[PDB]
Amino acid sequence: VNKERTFLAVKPDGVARGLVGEIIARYEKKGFVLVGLKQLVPTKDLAESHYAEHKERPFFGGLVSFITSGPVVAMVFEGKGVVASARLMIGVTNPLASAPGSIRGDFGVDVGRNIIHGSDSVESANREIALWFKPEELLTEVKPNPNLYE
Amino acid sequence: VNKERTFLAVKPDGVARGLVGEIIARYEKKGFVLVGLKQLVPTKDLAESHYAEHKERPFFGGLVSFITSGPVVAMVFEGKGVVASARLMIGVTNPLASAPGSIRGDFGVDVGRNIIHGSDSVESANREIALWFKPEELLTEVKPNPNLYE
Amino acid sequence: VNKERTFLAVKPDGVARGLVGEIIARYEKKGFVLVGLKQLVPTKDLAESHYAEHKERPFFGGLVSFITSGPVVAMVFEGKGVVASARLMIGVTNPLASAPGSIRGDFGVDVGRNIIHGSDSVESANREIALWFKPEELLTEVKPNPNLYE
Amino acid sequence: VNKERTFLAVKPDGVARGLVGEIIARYEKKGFVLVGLKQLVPTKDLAESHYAEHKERPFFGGLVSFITSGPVVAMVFEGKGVVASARLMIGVTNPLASAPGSIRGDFGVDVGRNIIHGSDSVESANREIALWFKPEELLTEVKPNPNLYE
Amino acid sequence: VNKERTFLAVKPDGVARGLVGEIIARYEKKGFVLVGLKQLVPTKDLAESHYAEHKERPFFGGLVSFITSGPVVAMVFEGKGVVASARLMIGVTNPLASAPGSIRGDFGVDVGRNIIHGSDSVESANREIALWFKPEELLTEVKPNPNLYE
Amino acid sequence: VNKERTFLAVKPDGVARGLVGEIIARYEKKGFVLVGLKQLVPTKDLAESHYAEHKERPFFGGLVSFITSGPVVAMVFEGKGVVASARLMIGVTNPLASAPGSIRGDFGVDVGRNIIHGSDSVESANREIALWFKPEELLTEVKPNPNLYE
Ligand SMILES: O=c1ccn([C@H]2C[C@H](F)[C@@H](COP(=O)(O)OP(=O)(O)O)O2)c(=O)[nH]1
């Protein structure tokens, strides 16, 4: 189904570096539809719930602090296999090991300052989208370019 | 002062044509700070109160019908002389008469489908910003790149 | 009417400099439809007919000699006010005096090597299109993006 | 030898999405020479002869029907190892699995709407070129930039 | 003559903002040849000799101070009418009044942080070139692309 | 450490092809700092020292004769893991086998005309930096964008 959605979030460093439009453009060019978009300064309760799976890890504390250190541009894109395509486009955890052409591969140098977040699966996508967006904030009537899908 | 703000809105045709990120990128490159950003399908009352100055004009009906025909990406940029600079970058009412280099000049061909809206003065900017954004949605602590301002 | 057409031609120097795709992309982003496209090495008869209005000027000789010195990418774009918009986008006769943003303004430095040709009026557009293109080579059913025209 | 040629074709979806110039630009930047270029609406005979190898497969029908559904920009590029490089730049059959940086990787989302066609070998290139282009439409004297070849 | 040269200098703000490559690329696309290039932290004596004309002006102190506050990428471009073309491409003194498409028009917002310096005339170019560059640092054998000049 | 440095050099072909600005921009976008920059026409001994390891190889003759055949834009970038990241961005020895997204992958076609040089290790970087740059020509103080490093 082409009604698959994922959660993307340009982090404080990506926003502070003027990468918001560049990132949105990459997804628009690919053919994914922006189902939701907004800028906010994450709160602790949200950063913590968002990174729940790492609550046990050492870095968790630093993850929750930086994400709430400034504005974030949260967004939702819809399309066929968007969760895996979104991540392929982002690159890998370490921006230095990310191939040229990917977001992190082109603009990132540190793992702590890795510009953007992308859901790693449909299960997490759905959880994260419900965490950052209210239903009233997501488009229902989507309908994509007919030159994209058969 | 560099704490001046303006209201920009990528209209249904700009959004539907995948111009959102391209437009945001132009403002970020310039040095202006994104103080608010969100996507929504305008409601008739908002379309009408926004286009108030034209309620007596023939085309008003089509303005309100179109802007509410699909999602709009509303946004607020802050910076020195941003209202006038924003409009200079947008181009003129008729995209066919807009010089290359400007948004409408590069992507527009019809006056009714002219991609974006920009406040025409600080008085209107202030009015519109309050019409589309709630105070909680606008960043307070702005702070731009020190290499932009003396 | 939006069924207006103009004749553009990337000249030997524009082609030899790898500017073909860059120029086509500029027009496509604008909203104009490619109704005809082909690469060929102009014959004297066609060069002369094309530059008829300059047959009595000193430079005519050099014009006819150069346009036939290599391959030319002839093309026809359709859209509202395309003839004047195409020219506005090209720039002026002398690339050095052409504004940044325009084709000649960005890539040209000499008037003899001014990269591209564009019809100067609908009258000449129609004459030139018939000179370079056979009716069978031009699209009849054009129909552009609905987000371009009201 | 650097006189190797390949057949590329931006399909109806690539054309209708305004990607013609973008794709041509990528090949010109690389250093390949455009030996033939033209736009046309393929006929059934040409669509079928082209996809001959697939005549017995299920999808054939949809392949022929789509490629003839609208205008195609056929083109031939010449250069060292152009057939393999052209394919490397196109990406893989499934645009979702295509790496960022490649044509399909950047703009494609469905395999039925995968933007461009490229010959898979020198044997097929030679066949297809003769299928789409008449000898008079192809450049004889090519000669590429001396800063490209040793 | 096409052996005209001009002196451009990306100031500390332009360099600190990652604009060096972007600026060099605009000039290379145009067709001008890079006759000299280097990065350095200007010394007072040089900054002062450079801005000699403004020695009596109020802002003089601030000019010499800023230009020496960080690295500058000094460069010399050669080409027909390069002194006037360079400035046309830079924009005007106040970046907010500079038209989209120009360097200052696209990236600058403050007159004190106006990104780049360009000679204002052939007399000044020759003076500044000799101030920043030693003869051994400038190319003798220039020879530009033949597709540029007639 | 983030004080790692590598030596990059746009060779005569990259320079002659107007690729200098394009290449530097890729590194600046990434987040690496330009610690040294200059254009020169390599002298025979510099070329030879530089390519010591290839001395006994059949092609050392043309390697030296080429690097010294025209101007080279030598430069030093600083940042975390810059030597390995720089290489990854350049692509592989044969540009035809280099992935789209990489410098060689996007612009190169021949191995003898492979646009750019990058150090292959920290040991070589340090050797080459000292070979091409005098200590006075390199910056001491770095100050990397704080949104790059944690
Ligand atoms: O057969 C050959 C192989 C490489 N080369 C040149 C290109 C390059 F600058 C130099 C060093 O090659 P190598 O170290 O293998 O590749 P790279 O590190 O990518 O430059 O050899 C040739 O001229 N001929």
Side-chain angles (χ1 to χ4, degrees):
Chain A
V1 70
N2 320 95
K3 292 216 89 288
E4 181 185 333
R5 298 175 167 187
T6 188
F7 174 80
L8 298 158
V10 180
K11 320 234 273 310
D13 55 302
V15 172
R17 288 179 64 190
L19 298 157
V20 183
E22 160 74 51
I23 293 164
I24 297 181
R26 286 180 175 216
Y27 289 110
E28 293 184 294
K29 301 186 215 155
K30 182 80 182 166
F32 299 135
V33 186
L34 189 62
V35 157
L37 174 66
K38 57 134 80 104
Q39 179 190 254
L40 67 161
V41 173
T43 177
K44 197 149 150 274
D45 28 290
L46 169 62
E48 284 177 341
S49 298
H50 174 74
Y51 282 127
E53 59 161 294
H54 300 279
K55 66 190 166 300
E56 248 71 58
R57 309 288 190 305
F59 54 82
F60 178 87
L63 277 182
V64 181
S65 279
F66 178 69
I67 193 173
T68 56
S69 86
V72 165
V73 176
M75 63 206 133
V76 174
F77 269 103
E78 179 179 302
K80 184 168 180 301
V82 69
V83 188
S85 202
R87 274 171 97 49
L88 182 52
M89 289 167 83
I90 289 177
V92 290
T93 315
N94 183 223
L96 285 169
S98 296
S102 45
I103 289 160
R104 296 189 180 156
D106 287 357
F107 313 110
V109 65
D110 222 61
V111 24
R113 296 287 170 276
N114 65 10
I115 319 162
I116 190 171
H117 154 92
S119 297
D120 65 356
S121 72
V122 173
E123 311 90 71
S124 47
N126 294 342
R127 181 195 171 253
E128 297 176 350
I129 290 183
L131 239 193
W132 301 65
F133 287 94
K134 285 90 278 194
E136 325 133 45
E137 302 179 328
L138 297 176
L139 304 165
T140 5
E141 235 269 349
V142 58
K143 180 50 194 153
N145 192 319
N147 295 283
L148 310 179
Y149 300 117
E150 187 186 321
Chain B
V1 87
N2 340 59
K3 191 89 193 311
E4 183 175 283
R5 296 183 173 163
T6 190
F7 166 91
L8 294 170
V10 191
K11 280 143 63 161
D13 63 296
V15 180
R17 287 183 57 202
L19 299 174
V20 185
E22 167 86 38
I23 293 172
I24 299 181
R26 288 179 175 220
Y27 288 98
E28 291 181 294
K29 286 174 178 149
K30 182 89 181 166
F32 299 133
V33 181
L34 197 47
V35 160
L37 181 68
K38 109 226 297 194
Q39 173 178 261
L40 72 164
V41 174
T43 188
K44 225 200 185 298
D45 30 287
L46 173 92
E48 276 187 286
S49 69
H50 179 69
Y51 278 140
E53 80 172 293
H54 293 108
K55 62 213 330 163
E56 317 258 77
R57 260 81 98 64
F59 53 80
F60 187 74
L63 280 194
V64 176
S65 275
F66 174 69
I67 222 170
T68 56
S69 76
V72 172
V73 178
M75 37 195 230
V76 176
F77 275 100
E78 174 179 306
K80 187 184 172 222
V82 66
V83 184
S85 209
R87 301 188 61 65
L88 182 52
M89 291 164 69
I90 286 166
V92 298
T93 310
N94 171 212
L96 287 183
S98 288
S102 60
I103 301 169
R104 283 166 194 174
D106 288 323
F107 312 131
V109 66
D110 192 32
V111 189
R113 298 275 184 276
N114 67 31
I115 301 111
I116 188 171
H117 162 93
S119 298
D120 51 10
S121 57
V122 181
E123 44 193 286
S124 327
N126 300 343
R127 174 183 150 282
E128 291 158 10
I129 300 170
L131 216 160
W132 298 70
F133 291 76
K134 301 273 174 165
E136 325 84 76
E137 320 188 278
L138 294 156
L139 272 286
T140 53
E141 305 196 70
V142 46
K143 262 211 298 170
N145 190 334
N147 293 288
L148 281 176
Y149 299 113
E150 191 169 33
Chain C
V1 92
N2 328 107
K3 301 238 171 283
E4 177 168 324
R5 305 181 162 183
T6 195
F7 176 80
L8 299 169
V10 180
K11 277 181 291 168
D13 64 284
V15 171
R17 291 173 59 199
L19 295 182
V20 176
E22 165 84 33
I23 300 173
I24 293 166
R26 300 216 180 194
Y27 290 116
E28 303 183 273
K29 277 177 184 166
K30 182 73 174 173
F32 297 146
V33 181
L34 198 47
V35 164
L37 164 62
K38 67 169 162 189
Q39 179 191 277
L40 67 168
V41 179
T43 65
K44 196 176 77 101
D45 348 302
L46 175 53
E48 291 181 348
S49 188
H50 179 71
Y51 281 118
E53 79 179 50
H54 298 326
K55 70 185 81 186
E56 287 171 73
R57 285 48 165 193
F59 63 79
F60 183 72
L63 291 196
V64 171
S65 306
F66 184 67
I67 220 180
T68 57
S69 72
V72 167
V73 176
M75 49 184 159
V76 183
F77 282 96
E78 174 188 318
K80 206 223 292 186
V82 68
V83 183
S85 211
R87 287 190 75 49
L88 177 52
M89 290 175 55
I90 286 176
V92 296
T93 306
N94 179 219
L96 285 166
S98 288
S102 60
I103 302 190
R104 287 172 177 172
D106 297 349
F107 317 110
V109 50
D110 204 313
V111 59
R113 298 281 171 289
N114 68 359
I115 307 145
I116 181 181
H117 167 98
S119 303
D120 61 15
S121 77
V122 171
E123 292 76 68
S124 40
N126 299 332
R127 180 214 171 216
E128 298 165 359
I129 298 184
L131 226 187
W132 300 73
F133 292 81
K134 311 307 93 187
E136 313 83 42
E137 308 174 328
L138 309 164
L139 290 190
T140 322
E141 295 293 88
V142 50
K143 208 52 261 170
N145 188 314
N147 300 294
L148 298 179
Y149 304 104
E150 179 72 70
Chain D
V1 81
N2 331 100
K3 274 186 169 293
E4 177 166 304
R5 294 178 173 171
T6 195
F7 170 74
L8 295 168
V10 176
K11 303 197 284 211
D13 56 313
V15 178
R17 286 177 55 205
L19 304 178
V20 186
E22 172 74 40
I23 286 157
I24 298 179
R26 294 189 176 210
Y27 287 100
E28 292 183 297
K29 281 170 172 55
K30 186 70 175 180
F32 296 135
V33 179
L34 191 56
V35 179
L37 170 65
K38 65 184 196 179
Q39 188 196 237
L40 72 173
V41 181
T43 190
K44 74 153 293 287
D45 280 9
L46 180 52
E48 282 185 350
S49 303
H50 180 67
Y51 286 129
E53 71 224 85
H54 296 321
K55 63 174 173 159
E56 231 46 74
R57 287 120 197 87
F59 56 85
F60 186 52
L63 285 191
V64 178
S65 283
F66 177 57
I67 206 171
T68 56
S69 80
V72 166
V73 170
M75 66 196 108
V76 178
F77 275 87
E78 175 172 307
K80 172 174 178 237
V82 55
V83 180
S85 200
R87 301 183 77 49
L88 178 47
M89 299 182 81
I90 294 187
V92 299
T93 314
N94 181 200
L96 288 176
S98 300
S102 53
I103 290 156
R104 279 167 196 182
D106 289 326
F107 315 119
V109 77
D110 197 325
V111 28
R113 296 293 176 277
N114 62 1
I115 312 116
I116 178 166
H117 160 85
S119 301
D120 59 49
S121 59
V122 170
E123 299 80 76
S124 74
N126 291 336
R127 189 194 118 250
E128 291 168 10
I129 292 172
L131 224 212
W132 297 66
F133 300 70
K134 299 185 198 286
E136 319 94 50
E137 313 182 307
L138 296 170
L139 297 196
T140 60
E141 294 150 289
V142 169
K143 262 256 272 51
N145 186 323
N147 300 269
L148 281 166
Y149 300 112
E150 167 151 72
Chain E
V1 75
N2 319 132
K3 170 88 169 54
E4 186 176 333
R5 306 194 166 170
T6 190
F7 179 75
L8 298 146
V10 186
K11 289 138 62 94
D13 63 302
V15 165
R17 289 173 64 218
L19 304 181
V20 178
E22 164 69 40
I23 287 170
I24 295 186
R26 291 191 183 202
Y27 290 103
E28 288 185 286
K29 283 185 172 82
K30 179 73 173 183
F32 294 134
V33 177
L34 189 54
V35 160
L37 172 63
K38 66 195 213 166
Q39 163 176 267
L40 71 167
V41 167
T43 171
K44 253 236 299 308
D45 328 292
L46 183 84
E48 291 197 336
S49 303
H50 175 79
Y51 288 120
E53 281 121 352
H54 309 28
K55 57 171 167 59
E56 321 93 329
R57 243 51 59 167
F59 49 76
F60 188 68
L63 294 179
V64 180
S65 183
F66 176 66
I67 220 201
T68 58
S69 301
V72 151
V73 171
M75 54 190 120
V76 175
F77 272 102
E78 205 214 75
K80 189 167 59 182
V82 65
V83 183
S85 207
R87 295 196 62 112
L88 188 54
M89 295 169 71
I90 292 171
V92 306
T93 317
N94 179 209
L96 287 174
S98 282
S102 60
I103 290 158
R104 291 178 179 160
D106 288 357
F107 314 114
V109 355
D110 215 2
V111 61
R113 293 288 162 282
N114 71 347
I115 305 141
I116 188 175
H117 159 85
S119 299
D120 58 21
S121 58
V122 189
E123 290 116 297
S124 304
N126 298 358
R127 178 188 167 266
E128 288 165 3
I129 287 177
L131 225 183
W132 293 72
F133 290 75
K134 296 298 87 188
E136 296 86 28
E137 316 179 315
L138 310 165
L139 304 193
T140 282
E141 265 102 6
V142 52
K143 261 312 285 178
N145 186 330
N147 311 297
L148 283 173
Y149 297 108
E150 185 169 27
Chain F
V1 58
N2 328 132
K3 236 283 179 295
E4 185 177 322
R5 306 180 169 186
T6 194
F7 173 74
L8 311 168
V10 185
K11 299 200 286 189
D13 53 318
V15 165
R17 292 181 60 206
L19 291 180
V20 177
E22 169 76 39
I23 294 169
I24 300 166
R26 281 164 184 247
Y27 287 102
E28 304 183 74
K29 287 173 183 159
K30 183 63 163 185
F32 299 131
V33 197
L34 190 52
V35 171
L37 167 57
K38 68 172 169 183
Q39 189 190 268
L40 71 135
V41 168
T43 203
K44 191 183 179 292
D45 40 291
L46 178 53
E48 298 202 324
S49 321
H50 184 65
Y51 284 147
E53 57 178 294
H54 308 295
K55 158 92 223 91
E56 247 88 60
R57 300 165 91 350
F59 56 78
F60 193 61
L63 240 193
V64 176
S65 287
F66 192 54
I67 247 277
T68 65
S69 75
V72 165
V73 175
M75 35 197 221
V76 171
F77 272 94
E78 171 176 319
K80 203 221 262 176
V82 61
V83 184
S85 203
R87 264 237 156 171
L88 179 61
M89 307 179 112
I90 294 164
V92 298
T93 309
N94 184 196
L96 284 166
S98 298
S102 61
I103 299 172
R104 287 189 172 138
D106 284 358
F107 310 118
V109 145
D110 208 355
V111 54
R113 301 279 170 275
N114 68 358
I115 312 143
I116 189 177
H117 170 81
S119 297
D120 57 5
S121 66
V122 171
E123 316 166 89
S124 316
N126 295 320
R127 173 196 168 241
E128 288 165 10
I129 286 184
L131 229 189
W132 298 73
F133 290 93
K134 316 275 60 73
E136 322 101 43
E137 304 163 343
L138 307 193
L139 302 179
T140 331
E141 358 67 66
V142 62
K143 271 188 181 182
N145 198 327
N147 300 286
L148 302 174
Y149 301 114
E150 177 171 59

